[PDB]
Subunit: 130 residues, 4 copies
Amino acid sequence: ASCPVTTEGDYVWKISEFYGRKPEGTYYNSLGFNIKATNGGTLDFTCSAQADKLEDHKWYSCGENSFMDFSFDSDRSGLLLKQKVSDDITYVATATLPNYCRAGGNGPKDFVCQGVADAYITLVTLPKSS
Amino acid sequence: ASCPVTTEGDYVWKISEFYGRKPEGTYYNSLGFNIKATNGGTLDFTCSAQADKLEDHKWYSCGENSFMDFSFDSDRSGLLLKQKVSDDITYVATATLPNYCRAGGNGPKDFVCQGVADAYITLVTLPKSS
Amino acid sequence: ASCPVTTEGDYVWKISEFYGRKPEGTYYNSLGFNIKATNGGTLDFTCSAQADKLEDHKWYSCGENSFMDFSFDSDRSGLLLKQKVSDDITYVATATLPNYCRAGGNGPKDFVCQGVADAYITLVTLPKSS
Amino acid sequence: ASCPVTTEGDYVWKISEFYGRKPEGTYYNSLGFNIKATNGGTLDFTCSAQADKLEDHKWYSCGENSFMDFSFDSDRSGLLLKQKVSDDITYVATATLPNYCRAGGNGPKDFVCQGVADAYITLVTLPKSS
Ligand SMILES: NCCCCCCCC(=O)O
Ligand SMILES: NCCCCCCCC(=O)O
Ligand SMILES: NCCCCCCCC(=O)O
Ligand SMILES: NCCCCCCCC(=O)O
Ligand SMILES: Nc1nc(N)c(N)c(O)n1
Ligand SMILES: Nc1nc(N)c(N)c(O)n1
Ligand SMILES: Nc1nc(N)c(N)c(O)n1
Ligand SMILES: Nc1nc(N)c(N)c(O)n1
Ligand SMILES: Nc1nc(N)c(N)c(O)n1
Ligand SMILES: Nc1nc(N)c(N)c(O)n1
Ligand SMILES: Nc1nc(N)c(N)c(O)n1
Ligand SMILES: Nc1nc(N)c(N)c(O)n1
């Protein structure tokens, strides 16, 4: 409404249901979130990754097939998405995914984090080239 | 080259590695194929479905998350894809996926089919509305 | 240690990282948890299900391939697992999966639940027959 | 019947619907097969792997969660399975998966292979230790 955020558009997607697990309270071993189109299109999918230790500032596929890559900066809960549409067109988008972490019960430094608010991202073309 | 087929374009995708299984030599219980962008974009994924009995002229998701649906007419090896880009824009596309079936060994009427040639599809906008 | 729970055995598995989403604060649309062997075997996997509305007291596969089924009673956070080992042998197992739900941000009655403690299940043979 | 093969048992599984793709007619980039219990138990799943280049004599998980690993010797179409049941018990099993390869259409040296017969494997305990 009067929120300083655009919540609909052909190049605007909603990010929701952020999850992550920090098995030792530091790095994530599991991270994910839902991505949905806002323009009445069909797109609605999970973007996630797992590893013994997930890295910051590293591209992960959103899934086995996915046309989308993502990267995370855990220090700022910052998400970066990338979509390469053609040889010459790539979109990127960013957001903060606010979340709350609490003890998960599976070890003395095990924490699980979940989103406390949705975020909206805008996809914008990267100049060809850098 | 001199083939009566367009093999590159922003709205042209390559279909390859068609597979299917007909457990009793009639209906499919498993069907799939690979879809790849031709314009240098990243898109490259598997579209598939399984059921005790897959139906002709029925939409199946390409995968759990997928932004794409497909339907198959097994009588003509005809594929139909659909992509709903927005409230008002939907693309559809069609092709024939030539294939060869041979005995699969898992029952006396078990046949497995695999693609013998790639196919190229063109995505075109459905008039709003029918 | 002095806890009234068995945490290791060939037929004892650890349940951890319970998650669930209640989009309208009532039924789950997403539920899952991790299952791990305690006896030094390799088994370690996710059991989950999604639907527009998940049902209580209904078997869901743990995953596409899984040899395990589960059911949930949301009124008591009660889990039931079933493993059919042979024509004549089926194991079942139960537990409570304690969890905490909090607002998820994706709608005014959206809640996300996560496990606050691990649980241990014991697999026991169902008499042949009921 | 009078076949020199055991087709049923608690430790005997049926292997069927072998598939593989050799993009350049040499190494596989995709390999898979179905595994089913013969004793009336529920087990029935796909074991597969993909990579730019799959390696011989290397363990691959059967799937993301799987309790089973496999390895393949492409020179003899030989399959090896491994199941670690406990700290001290591991089963292994072997078979030949007969198959036929034919041109797949997606490049001049692209071949796709599919099983021509089912195979039966027997799981047997590895002595503790080697
Ligand atoms: N006129 C067509 C506008 C809809 C384009 C939306 C593309 C979003 C994307 O996948 O980045
Ligand atoms: N100028 C942008 C043209 C590239 C658009 C390709 C969209 C293909 C699709 O997902 O249907
Ligand atoms: N002596 C063999 C004992 C290990 C059996 C564990 C089986 C657990 C299961 O999948 O239910
Ligand atoms: N008496 C119980 C016998 C059934 C055991 C089958 C175990 C097969 C496996 O997962 O290797
Ligand atoms: N929706 C969802 N949330 C999660 N925490 C996980 N792990 C998962 O796989 N899917
Ligand atoms: N970590 C994680 N979060 C999610 N939301 C999902 N779907 C998933 O599979 N994994
Ligand atoms: N005009 C247009 N641009 C895009 N980036 C996409 N994906 C699309 O479908 N149409
Ligand atoms: N039937 C089928 N075909 C395919 N090409 C793939 N990837 C799949 O998962 N299933
Ligand atoms: N809901 C849910 N929870 C999980 N722990 C996982 N792995 C999953 O895929 N989905
Ligand atoms: N049943 C099946 N066969 C295949 N060739 C493939 N690729 C797949 O994913 N599933
Ligand atoms: N290569 C391959 N073969 C299969 N039989 C299956 N299920 C799969 O996913 N991939
Ligand atoms: N006696 C027995 N041995 C095994 N190896 C397994 N898996 C099982 O369920 N029961």
